[PDB]
Amino acid sequence: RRWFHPNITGVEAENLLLTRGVDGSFLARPSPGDFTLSVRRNGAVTHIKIQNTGDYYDLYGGEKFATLAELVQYYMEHQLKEIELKYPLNCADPTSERWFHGHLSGKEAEKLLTEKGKHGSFLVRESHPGDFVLSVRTGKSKVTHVMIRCQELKYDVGGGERFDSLTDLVEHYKKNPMVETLGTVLQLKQPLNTTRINAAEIESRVRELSKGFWEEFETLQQQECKLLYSRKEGQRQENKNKNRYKNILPFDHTRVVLHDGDPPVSDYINANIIMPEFKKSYIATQGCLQNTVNDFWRMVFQENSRVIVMTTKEVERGKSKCVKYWPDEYALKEYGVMRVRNVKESAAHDYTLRELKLSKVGQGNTERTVWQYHFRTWPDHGVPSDPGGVLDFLEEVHHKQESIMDAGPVVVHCSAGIGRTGTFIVIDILIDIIREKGVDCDIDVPKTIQMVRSQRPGMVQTEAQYRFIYMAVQHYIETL
């Protein structure tokens, strides 16, 4: 993912592409949640705007994607008009690397590696001004410091190969470890963790990030190229029109597989099982289309789901984000083989609750109650100013879920089923930790996100949602 340049101005991007690039050379950069794709064509530079309001990356004059990496993979392998993406123009900046610590002292580094690190835990820090230091833990346990010289724009450890960036140096010494005079192997197994905080410390960490949040978010984004898993099933011709956005697809390994279909390609839904890994599970899905309503109810039936979380209005800015897949209050409707009764609707301030009864037609004893929590007050763009509303909603949802024996995964959807959907699920996972363990437990916001993003692509879209998750968790701790 070297083609993303986090601290480059438009003019710097142009000059870099004109002096170090060729035609088909490209880079991506941040602007507010806006990004630019800069490409060289006919010895000139075209800047393509990519917007993200919270739901997806919307490439102007192109399509919608779950991640910038999936956007770059799509155009490199394929469509882009006023433009070919051929050569990634590599960024040499280490700011968004998990191993980079910038201004950090030797003793501070050793203390961090002693308290937080294990065998193979490493970091890169500033030194000899201009130079760098590789501090690595092995194991009795020990910390070893290796001097990184910066010489005429290249990096080296005293001899051998001179590297164009700290990243190339680290990737080379990761695969080819340094061996010490007395036989110690300086294995670079994993970067030092800096984001795992204790829940009681939330407020302090949030004061630090508010000075921050952007840097911590971009380092998480720099890990998305590890999550380019296969999405073949959504790509099939017969599944294309089952997707709200042609390129926003489920991963094959965690997709919900629909069984007992009408006897051609009856097993597909744009949905992924989200299993927290470190008690409830989730199904993150898109808002139904007219042609997927029946599939949606087939999923809820098969997965034994007793609770649905809807985090969008049906219509936002005159565009359908989700079709009404539930009957009118007191009405009964059939969706293929599935029968659904809207028993009662209860209107709260931030949401509506719909009590539904789902059963299979021809078998009356298959009936079960599905509780639909329709969160109605999320802003059209951005995130709520206060997390209180989202928090009371999740507490109601949790308690409903817990009150039902053998209830299947909680169904969560918005429009694409990645941004608001990811935000609510990650808030829910983190608050579940704090509910059963209290203030005395470790929480790691970007690690939980990366774990959820490995199950459905693009979970948690913006820096605004990222910060909102931290505000929600801090608020939940504050009100215990």
Coordinates of C-alpha atoms in Angstrom, one line a residue:
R1 CA 0.0 0.0 0.0
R2 CA 3.0 2.3 -0.6
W3 CA 1.0 4.4 -3.2
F4 CA -0.8 6.3 -0.3
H5 CA 1.1 9.5 0.7
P6 CA -0.3 10.7 4.0
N7 CA 1.5 14.1 4.3
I8 CA 1.9 15.3 0.7
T9 CA 0.4 18.6 -0.8
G10 CA -1.2 18.6 -4.3
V11 CA 1.9 20.5 -5.8
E12 CA 4.3 18.0 -4.0
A13 CA 2.2 15.1 -5.5
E14 CA 2.4 16.7 -9.1
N15 CA 6.1 17.4 -8.9
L16 CA 6.9 13.8 -7.5
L17 CA 4.8 12.2 -10.4
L18 CA 6.5 14.5 -13.0
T19 CA 10.1 13.9 -11.7
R20 CA 10.0 10.3 -10.4
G21 CA 7.0 8.9 -12.3
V22 CA 6.1 8.0 -15.9
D23 CA 2.6 7.7 -17.7
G24 CA 0.3 5.4 -15.7
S25 CA 2.2 6.5 -12.5
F26 CA -0.2 7.1 -9.6
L27 CA -0.6 8.0 -5.9
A28 CA -3.4 8.6 -3.5
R29 CA -3.4 11.2 -0.7
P30 CA -5.7 12.8 1.9
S31 CA -7.2 16.3 1.3
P32 CA -12.3 16.4 5.9
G33 CA -12.5 12.7 4.9
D34 CA -11.7 13.7 1.2
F35 CA -8.9 12.0 -0.8
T36 CA -7.3 12.5 -4.2
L37 CA -6.1 9.9 -6.8
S38 CA -3.2 11.7 -8.7
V39 CA -2.3 10.1 -12.1
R40 CA 0.1 10.9 -14.9
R41 CA -1.3 10.8 -18.5
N42 CA 0.3 12.3 -21.7
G43 CA 3.1 13.8 -19.5
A44 CA 0.4 15.7 -17.5
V45 CA -1.2 15.2 -14.0
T46 CA -5.0 14.5 -13.4
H47 CA -6.3 14.7 -9.9
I48 CA -9.4 12.5 -9.2
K49 CA -11.6 13.2 -6.2
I50 CA -12.7 10.3 -3.9
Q51 CA -15.2 11.3 -1.2
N52 CA -16.2 9.3 1.9
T53 CA -19.2 10.6 3.9
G54 CA -19.3 7.4 6.1
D55 CA -20.7 4.7 3.8
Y56 CA -18.1 4.1 1.1
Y57 CA -15.3 5.7 -1.0
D58 CA -17.0 7.3 -3.9
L59 CA -14.6 7.9 -6.8
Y60 CA -15.8 10.8 -8.9
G61 CA -16.2 9.5 -12.5
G62 CA -15.9 6.0 -11.2
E63 CA -17.5 3.5 -8.9
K64 CA -18.0 3.0 -5.1
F65 CA -15.6 0.8 -3.0
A66 CA -15.1 -0.6 0.5
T67 CA -11.4 0.4 0.8
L68 CA -8.9 2.5 -1.2
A69 CA -6.9 -0.7 -1.7
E70 CA -9.9 -2.4 -3.4
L71 CA -10.4 0.8 -5.5
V72 CA -6.7 0.6 -6.6
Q73 CA -6.8 -3.2 -7.2
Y74 CA -10.0 -2.8 -9.3
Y75 CA -8.6 -0.1 -11.7
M76 CA -5.1 -1.7 -11.9
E77 CA -6.7 -5.1 -12.9
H78 CA -9.4 -3.4 -15.2
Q79 CA -13.3 1.9 -16.6
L80 CA -11.5 5.1 -15.4
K81 CA -12.3 8.1 -17.6
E82 CA -11.9 11.9 -17.6
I83 CA -7.0 7.2 -17.3
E84 CA -4.9 4.0 -16.7
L85 CA -3.5 3.0 -13.2
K86 CA -0.2 1.2 -14.1
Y87 CA 2.7 2.2 -11.6
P88 CA 2.3 2.8 -7.9
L89 CA 4.4 5.8 -7.0
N90 CA 5.9 4.6 -3.6
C91 CA 5.9 6.6 -0.5
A92 CA 9.0 6.6 1.7
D93 CA 7.4 8.3 4.7
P94 CA 7.2 5.9 7.8
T95 CA 4.6 7.9 9.9
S96 CA 1.7 5.4 9.3
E97 CA 3.9 2.3 10.1
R98 CA 3.0 0.5 13.4
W99 CA 6.8 0.1 14.1
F100 CA 7.6 3.9 13.7
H101 CA 7.7 5.9 17.0
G102 CA 9.4 9.1 15.7
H103 CA 10.8 11.2 18.6
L104 CA 11.4 8.6 21.3
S105 CA 14.3 8.0 23.7
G106 CA 16.4 4.9 24.3
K107 CA 15.3 4.4 27.9
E108 CA 11.6 5.2 27.0
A109 CA 11.9 2.5 24.1
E110 CA 13.5 -0.1 26.5
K111 CA 10.7 0.6 29.2
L112 CA 8.0 0.3 26.5
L113 CA 9.5 -3.0 25.2
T114 CA 9.8 -4.3 28.8
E115 CA 6.2 -3.5 29.8
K116 CA 4.4 -4.1 26.4
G117 CA 6.8 -6.3 24.3
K118 CA 7.7 -10.0 23.7
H119 CA 10.3 -12.0 21.8
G120 CA 10.7 -10.3 18.4
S121 CA 8.9 -7.0 19.4
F122 CA 10.5 -4.1 17.7
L123 CA 10.4 -0.3 17.0
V124 CA 12.1 2.4 14.9
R125 CA 12.7 5.8 16.6
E126 CA 14.7 9.0 15.9
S127 CA 18.4 9.1 17.1
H128 CA 23.2 11.7 15.8
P129 CA 20.2 13.9 14.5
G130 CA 18.7 12.8 11.2
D131 CA 19.7 9.1 11.9
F132 CA 17.3 6.4 13.3
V133 CA 17.5 3.5 15.8
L134 CA 16.0 0.0 15.6
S135 CA 15.1 -1.1 19.2
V136 CA 14.3 -4.9 19.3
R137 CA 13.3 -7.3 22.2
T138 CA 14.5 -11.0 22.3
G139 CA 13.8 -13.8 24.8
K140 CA 16.3 -13.9 30.3
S141 CA 15.0 -11.2 28.0
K142 CA 17.0 -8.3 26.5
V143 CA 16.6 -5.1 24.4
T144 CA 19.1 -4.5 21.4
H145 CA 19.6 -1.1 19.8
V146 CA 20.8 -1.1 16.1
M147 CA 21.9 2.3 14.6
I148 CA 20.2 3.3 11.3
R149 CA 22.3 5.8 9.4
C150 CA 20.7 8.3 7.0
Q151 CA 23.1 9.0 4.2
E152 CA 22.2 11.1 1.1
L153 CA 18.5 10.0 1.3
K154 CA 19.3 6.2 1.9
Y155 CA 19.2 4.1 5.1
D156 CA 21.7 1.4 6.3
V157 CA 22.7 -0.5 9.5
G158 CA 26.5 0.3 9.1
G159 CA 27.2 -1.8 6.0
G160 CA 25.8 -3.8 3.1
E161 CA 22.6 -2.6 1.2
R162 CA 21.5 1.1 1.4
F163 CA 17.6 1.4 1.4
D164 CA 15.4 4.0 -0.2
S165 CA 13.1 4.1 2.9
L166 CA 13.0 2.8 6.5
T167 CA 10.2 0.5 5.3
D168 CA 12.4 -1.3 2.8
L169 CA 15.1 -1.6 5.5
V170 CA 12.6 -3.0 8.0
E171 CA 11.0 -5.4 5.4
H172 CA 14.5 -6.7 4.5
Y173 CA 15.7 -7.2 8.1
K174 CA 12.3 -8.7 8.9
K175 CA 12.9 -11.5 6.3
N176 CA 16.7 -11.6 6.7
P177 CA 17.3 -11.1 10.5
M178 CA 20.6 -9.6 11.8
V179 CA 22.8 -12.1 13.6
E180 CA 25.0 -10.7 16.5
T181 CA 28.7 -11.5 17.1
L182 CA 27.7 -14.1 19.8
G183 CA 24.9 -15.7 17.9
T184 CA 21.7 -13.8 18.9
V185 CA 19.2 -13.6 16.0
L186 CA 17.6 -10.1 16.0
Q187 CA 14.2 -11.4 14.7
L188 CA 11.7 -8.6 13.9
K189 CA 8.5 -10.7 14.7
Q190 CA 5.9 -8.0 15.4
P191 CA 5.8 -4.2 16.0
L192 CA 5.4 -2.9 19.5
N193 CA 1.8 -2.4 20.5
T194 CA 1.0 1.3 21.4
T195 CA -2.8 1.3 21.1
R196 CA -3.9 -1.3 23.7
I197 CA -5.0 0.8 26.7
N198 CA -6.6 -0.2 30.0
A199 CA -10.3 0.8 29.9
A200 CA -9.8 3.1 33.1
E201 CA -7.2 5.0 31.0
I202 CA -9.7 5.9 28.2
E203 CA -10.1 9.6 29.2
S204 CA -6.4 10.1 29.3
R205 CA -5.8 8.4 25.9
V206 CA -8.7 10.5 24.4
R207 CA -7.1 13.8 25.7
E208 CA -3.8 12.7 23.9
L209 CA -5.5 11.8 20.6
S210 CA -7.6 15.1 20.6
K211 CA -4.4 17.3 20.5
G212 CA -3.8 12.1 17.3
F213 CA -7.0 10.4 16.1
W214 CA -6.0 11.0 12.4
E215 CA -2.5 9.5 12.8
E216 CA -3.9 6.4 14.7
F217 CA -6.6 6.0 12.0
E218 CA -4.1 6.2 9.0
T219 CA -1.8 3.6 10.7
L220 CA -4.9 1.2 10.8
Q221 CA -5.7 2.1 7.1
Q222 CA -2.1 1.1 6.3
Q223 CA -3.0 -2.5 7.3
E224 CA -5.9 -2.8 4.8
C225 CA -3.7 -4.3 2.0
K226 CA -3.4 -7.4 4.3
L227 CA -7.2 -7.8 4.0
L228 CA -7.5 -8.2 0.2
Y229 CA -9.3 -11.6 0.6
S230 CA -11.4 -13.2 -2.2
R231 CA -14.9 -11.9 -3.0
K232 CA -15.6 -14.3 -5.9
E233 CA -19.1 -15.3 -5.1
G234 CA -20.5 -11.7 -5.2
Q235 CA -18.7 -11.2 -8.5
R236 CA -20.6 -14.1 -10.3
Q237 CA -23.1 -12.9 -13.0
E238 CA -26.2 -14.2 -11.2
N239 CA -25.1 -12.4 -8.0
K240 CA -24.3 -9.0 -9.5
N241 CA -27.9 -7.6 -9.1
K242 CA -28.0 -9.0 -5.5
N243 CA -25.5 -6.2 -4.5
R244 CA -26.5 -2.6 -3.7
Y245 CA -23.0 -1.5 -4.9
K246 CA -21.5 -3.7 -7.6
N247 CA -18.0 -3.6 -6.0
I248 CA -18.9 -3.6 -2.3
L249 CA -18.8 -7.3 -1.8
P250 CA -18.7 -9.9 1.1
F251 CA -15.6 -12.0 1.7
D252 CA -16.1 -15.6 0.5
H253 CA -14.7 -17.1 3.8
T254 CA -17.2 -15.4 6.1
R255 CA -20.2 -14.9 3.8
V256 CA -23.7 -16.1 5.0
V257 CA -24.4 -19.2 2.8
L258 CA -28.2 -19.5 2.2
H259 CA -29.4 -23.2 2.2
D260 CA -32.8 -24.8 1.2
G261 CA -33.2 -22.5 -1.8
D262 CA -35.7 -22.7 -4.7
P263 CA -34.7 -25.8 -6.8
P264 CA -30.0 -22.1 -9.8
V265 CA -27.8 -19.8 -7.6
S266 CA -30.0 -19.5 -4.5
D267 CA -27.2 -19.4 -1.8
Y268 CA -26.1 -15.8 -2.0
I269 CA -26.7 -12.7 0.2
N270 CA -24.3 -9.7 0.5
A271 CA -23.7 -10.5 4.3
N272 CA -20.9 -11.6 6.5
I273 CA -20.8 -13.4 9.9
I274 CA -18.9 -11.2 12.4
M275 CA -17.4 -13.3 15.2
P276 CA -15.4 -11.3 17.8
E277 CA -12.0 -12.9 18.3
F278 CA -9.4 -12.1 21.0
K279 CA -20.1 -13.8 23.5
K280 CA -22.6 -12.7 20.7
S281 CA -22.0 -12.8 17.0
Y282 CA -23.3 -10.4 14.3
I283 CA -24.4 -10.5 10.7
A284 CA -23.2 -7.3 8.9
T285 CA -25.3 -6.8 5.8
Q286 CA -26.5 -4.2 3.3
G287 CA -30.0 -2.7 3.2
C288 CA -32.3 -5.0 1.1
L289 CA -33.0 -4.2 -2.6
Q290 CA -36.5 -5.2 -3.9
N291 CA -35.0 -8.5 -5.4
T292 CA -33.2 -9.4 -2.0
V293 CA -36.1 -9.0 0.5
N294 CA -36.9 -12.7 0.3
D295 CA -33.2 -13.6 0.7
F296 CA -32.9 -11.4 3.8
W297 CA -35.8 -13.2 5.5
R298 CA -34.3 -16.6 4.5
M299 CA -31.1 -15.5 6.3
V300 CA -32.8 -14.3 9.5
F301 CA -34.8 -17.6 9.5
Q302 CA -31.7 -19.9 8.9
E303 CA -29.4 -18.1 11.3
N304 CA -32.0 -18.1 14.0
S305 CA -31.6 -14.3 14.4
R306 CA -33.9 -12.7 17.0
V307 CA -32.7 -9.1 16.7
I308 CA -32.2 -6.8 13.8
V309 CA -30.4 -3.4 14.0
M310 CA -31.2 -1.0 11.2
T311 CA -29.0 2.1 11.2
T312 CA -30.3 4.1 8.2
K313 CA -33.7 5.7 7.3
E314 CA -35.2 4.0 4.2
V315 CA -34.6 7.2 2.2
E316 CA -31.7 9.7 2.6
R317 CA -31.3 12.7 0.2
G318 CA -34.0 11.3 -2.1
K319 CA -32.2 8.0 -2.6
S320 CA -33.3 4.6 -1.3
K321 CA -30.7 3.3 1.2
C322 CA -33.0 0.3 2.3
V323 CA -36.3 -1.0 1.0
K324 CA -39.1 -1.6 3.5
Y325 CA -38.7 -5.4 4.2
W326 CA -41.1 -5.4 7.1
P327 CA -44.9 -5.2 7.0
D328 CA -47.0 -2.2 8.1
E329 CA -48.0 -2.2 11.9
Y330 CA -50.6 -4.9 12.5
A331 CA -50.2 -6.3 8.9
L332 CA -49.1 -9.7 7.8
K333 CA -47.0 -10.2 4.6
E334 CA -45.4 -13.1 2.8
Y335 CA -41.8 -12.8 1.5
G336 CA -41.4 -16.0 -0.6
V337 CA -41.6 -19.0 1.8
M338 CA -41.4 -16.6 4.8
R339 CA -44.3 -15.1 6.6
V340 CA -43.9 -11.9 8.7
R341 CA -46.3 -10.2 11.1
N342 CA -45.6 -6.7 12.4
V343 CA -47.1 -7.2 15.9
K344 CA -46.5 -3.7 17.4
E345 CA -44.2 -0.6 16.8
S346 CA -42.9 1.4 19.9
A347 CA -41.5 4.8 19.1
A348 CA -38.6 6.1 21.2
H349 CA -36.6 9.3 20.8
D350 CA -33.7 8.0 18.6
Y351 CA -35.3 4.8 17.3
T352 CA -38.4 2.7 16.6
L353 CA -38.8 -0.8 17.8
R354 CA -40.9 -3.2 15.6
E355 CA -42.0 -6.5 17.1
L356 CA -42.1 -9.0 14.2
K357 CA -43.2 -12.6 14.1
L358 CA -41.3 -14.7 11.5
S359 CA -42.4 -18.2 10.5
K360 CA -42.1 -20.5 7.5
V361 CA -45.3 -20.9 5.4
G362 CA -46.8 -24.4 5.8
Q363 CA -45.3 -24.9 9.3
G364 CA -46.9 -22.8 12.1
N365 CA -44.6 -24.1 14.9
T366 CA -41.6 -22.4 13.2
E367 CA -42.7 -19.0 14.5
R368 CA -40.3 -16.8 16.5
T369 CA -40.3 -13.1 17.4
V370 CA -37.8 -10.8 15.6
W371 CA -37.2 -7.5 17.3
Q372 CA -36.3 -4.7 14.8
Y373 CA -34.4 -1.7 16.3
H374 CA -34.5 0.9 13.7
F375 CA -32.1 3.7 14.7
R376 CA -33.6 6.8 13.0
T377 CA -31.6 9.8 14.1
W378 CA -28.1 9.2 12.7
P379 CA -27.1 12.4 10.6
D380 CA -27.1 12.1 6.8
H381 CA -23.3 12.9 6.7
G382 CA -20.8 12.7 9.6
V383 CA -21.6 11.2 13.0
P384 CA -23.8 12.2 16.1
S385 CA -22.4 15.0 18.2
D386 CA -23.2 12.9 21.3
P387 CA -22.9 9.1 21.7
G388 CA -25.5 8.8 24.5
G389 CA -28.3 7.9 22.1
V390 CA -26.3 5.2 20.3
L391 CA -25.2 3.8 23.7
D392 CA -28.8 3.6 25.2
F393 CA -29.9 1.9 21.9
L394 CA -27.1 -0.7 22.1
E395 CA -27.9 -1.3 25.8
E396 CA -31.6 -2.0 24.9
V397 CA -30.4 -4.3 21.9
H398 CA -27.9 -6.2 24.2
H399 CA -30.5 -6.8 26.9
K400 CA -33.2 -8.0 24.3
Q401 CA -30.5 -10.3 22.7
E402 CA -29.5 -11.6 26.2
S403 CA -33.1 -12.2 27.3
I404 CA -33.7 -14.8 24.4
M405 CA -32.3 -18.4 24.9
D406 CA -30.3 -19.8 21.8
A407 CA -30.8 -16.5 19.8
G408 CA -28.7 -16.5 16.7
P409 CA -26.4 -13.6 15.5
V410 CA -27.5 -10.0 15.8
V411 CA -28.3 -8.7 12.3
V412 CA -26.8 -5.2 11.6
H413 CA -27.3 -3.2 8.4
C414 CA -27.1 0.4 7.0
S415 CA -26.9 1.1 3.2
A416 CA -23.6 -0.7 2.0
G417 CA -23.3 -2.5 5.4
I418 CA -19.8 -1.4 6.2
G419 CA -19.6 2.2 7.7
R420 CA -22.4 2.8 10.2
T421 CA -22.8 -1.0 10.5
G422 CA -19.1 -1.3 11.4
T423 CA -19.3 1.6 13.8
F424 CA -22.2 0.1 15.8
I425 CA -20.8 -3.5 15.8
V426 CA -17.3 -2.3 17.0
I427 CA -18.9 0.0 19.7
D428 CA -21.1 -3.1 20.7
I429 CA -18.0 -5.5 20.9
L430 CA -15.9 -3.0 23.1
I431 CA -18.9 -2.1 25.5
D432 CA -19.5 -6.0 25.8
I433 CA -15.9 -6.3 27.2
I434 CA -16.5 -3.4 29.7
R435 CA -19.9 -4.8 30.7
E436 CA -18.7 -8.2 31.8
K437 CA -15.2 -7.1 33.1
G438 CA -15.7 -3.4 34.0
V439 CA -12.9 -0.8 33.9
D440 CA -10.3 -3.5 34.5
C441 CA -9.6 -5.0 31.1
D442 CA -7.5 -4.0 28.1
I443 CA -9.3 -2.5 25.1
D444 CA -7.5 -2.0 21.7
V445 CA -9.7 0.0 19.3
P446 CA -7.7 -0.4 16.0
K447 CA -7.0 -4.1 16.7
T448 CA -10.8 -4.9 17.2
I449 CA -11.4 -2.9 14.0
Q450 CA -8.8 -4.8 12.0
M451 CA -10.2 -8.1 13.4
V452 CA -13.7 -7.1 12.2
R453 CA -12.4 -5.8 8.8
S454 CA -10.9 -9.2 8.2
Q455 CA -14.5 -10.6 8.2
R456 CA -16.2 -8.0 6.1
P457 CA -14.2 -5.3 4.1
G458 CA -14.3 -1.7 5.0
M459 CA -15.8 -2.1 8.5
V460 CA -15.7 1.5 10.0
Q461 CA -15.3 3.9 7.1
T462 CA -14.1 7.3 8.4
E463 CA -11.9 9.0 10.9
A464 CA -15.1 10.7 12.2
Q465 CA -16.6 7.2 13.0
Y466 CA -13.2 6.1 14.5
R467 CA -13.2 9.0 16.9
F468 CA -17.0 8.5 17.6
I469 CA -16.2 4.8 18.7
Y470 CA -13.6 6.3 21.2
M471 CA -16.1 8.9 22.4
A472 CA -18.8 6.2 22.8
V473 CA -16.5 3.9 24.8
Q474 CA -15.2 6.8 27.0
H475 CA -18.9 7.9 27.6
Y476 CA -19.9 4.3 28.5
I477 CA -17.0 4.1 31.0
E478 CA -17.8 7.6 32.4
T479 CA -21.5 6.6 33.1
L480 CA -20.8 3.4 35.1

